[PDB]
Amino acid sequence: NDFYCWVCHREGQVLCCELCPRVYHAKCLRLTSEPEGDWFCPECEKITVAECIETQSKAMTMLTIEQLSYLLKFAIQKMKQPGTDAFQKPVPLEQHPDYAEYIFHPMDLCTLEKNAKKKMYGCTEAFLADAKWILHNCIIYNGGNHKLTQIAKVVIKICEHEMNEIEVCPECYLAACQKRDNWFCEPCSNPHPLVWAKLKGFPFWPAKALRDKDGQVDARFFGQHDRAWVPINNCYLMSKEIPFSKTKSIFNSAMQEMEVYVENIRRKFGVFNYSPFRTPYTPNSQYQMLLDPTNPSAGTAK
């Protein structure tokens, strides 16, 4: 087991996880009572939940461990930004002979890579938790205000970001990693409804509704291809007439790209139903995939 706390990276009396090497201060878990018997730490428990078939994420249901490993390889590549040389290969004892005296569990991006390849991450949380060893160990051996520690903070933040992308949509993620011909125009297996998204001070814009949380929808914009939250309450299902009216040229480009997407959805699933003017987007909307918009009881495309 590790001697330094997983949260504050300092020593002192700690609780020792029974599955993994990590250790925690009670104060740092904000414990309110003492654990009774064998103790599993928050990282182990999070992973246990995320990898249980009855409670896995929507991204994990649709991925096998091998597919997810491929996505993880892409994420490792995004973590090796220029400037990250100190973390790409295990620290040599020739450069730091005392290293093993402080770091109970070494970790580097190359090891992350090989482990991902050996298909030993069952979920994105497993992966980010393993990645954080790099930062933890950096803080222990170089100190929290070190320059290298600043870099390790960047790579753990890129890691968080990519894990989140994979979890929002694996298929989106893979298509954006490969960047094939018109990659943005490929429908996903559960196709995101197309909407007019609206940001302050910007016209209505064609977008993929990727998800809803607390009155917002996470729109991935045609043309520009970034993602941003927009209020549910001024969001409308894609239509032939625009909700209002600017910056014409790039808009026409985005429209063309959306129309290619519509054609692809029609070939993949057989339908795409445009909405009447200013039809408010609802969460988990299905109108666009209805076999007969007149008659919802017929169901949607499989």
Partner: protein, 130 residues
């Protein structure tokens, strides 16, 4: 971290870029940078005079992105990935992961050129690259 953001100021960013793409508009460069203490991109400046003029607006304390149109036939598009010599290494590292997303935002980038002094911005060398 969400990373580079194009939400706040979106209209200004795309208005400058659209000016650069338009053949009729005189402007052939736009210059973007981050807002202080934030990952949201903002328009810093824009104008005519191509690479020669644009190299005059780069700041040594900032990460900036230069989108310049370069022409006798159809124009090609250069994105200058500027990192000032006085930008901290950690922020160079974080911003490095934004470049691709910026190129994706300003559709049609033909070449990306990394730069930290004006001397990295040679109109000839860039031209031969295209």
């Amino acid at each position: 971290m969400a990373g580079v953001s194009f939400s706040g100021h979106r209209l200004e960013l795309l208005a400058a870029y659209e000016e650069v793409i338009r053949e009729e508009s005189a402007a052939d460069w736009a210059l973007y940078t981050y807002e202080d203490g934030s990952d949201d991109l903002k328009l810093a400046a824009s104008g005519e005079g191509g690479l020669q003029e644009l190299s005059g607006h780069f700041e040594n304390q900032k990460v900036m992105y230069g989108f310049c149109s370069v022409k006798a036939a159809l124009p090609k598009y250069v994105l200058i990935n500027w990192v000032g010599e006085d930008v901290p290494d950690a922020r160079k590292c974080a911003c490095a992961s934004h470049v691709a997303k910026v190129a994706e935002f300003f559709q049609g980038v033909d070449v990306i050129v990394n730069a930290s002094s004006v001397e990295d911005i040679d109109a000839g060398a860039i031209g031969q690259r295209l």
